[PDB]
Design a protein around this nucleic acid. Structure first.
Length: 48
RNA sequence: CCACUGUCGUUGAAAAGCCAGGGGAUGACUUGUGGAUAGGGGUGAAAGGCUAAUCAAACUCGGUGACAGCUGGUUCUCCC
């Protein structure tokens, strides 16, 4: 290894995790991918 | 000691009063002090009344972040 500065993970290795509800531009704002009023949009929903 | 009528007051002087009238006023009366009955329990000349401005089940803490197919909200950017 050269240095603790120049260590890259090797493109494709990492990905940014998704963050719901952080504005219009991120693609996951407001509802956060959940849709509208319904059971599956709620805070403890699942598929059973 | 009560509370029948009306006006006023209704961000009141007052979370139920004032004023003018009204009822009982030796009685199943009114009242002081202490005590007893405790929550699905009490107490009730019975209105589901009252049980500390809380009552078709008090209050406080705990189970407890109860559950909520419901309502609200959900935060930077650009490209397909």
């Amino acid at each position: 290894g050269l240095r603790l500065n120049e260590l890259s993970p090797g493109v494709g290795a990492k990905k940014t995790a998704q963050r719901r509800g952080r504005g219009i531009g991120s693609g996951l704002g407001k509802t956060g991918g959940r849709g509208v009023k319904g059971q599956k949009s709620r805070s403890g929903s699942s598929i059973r």
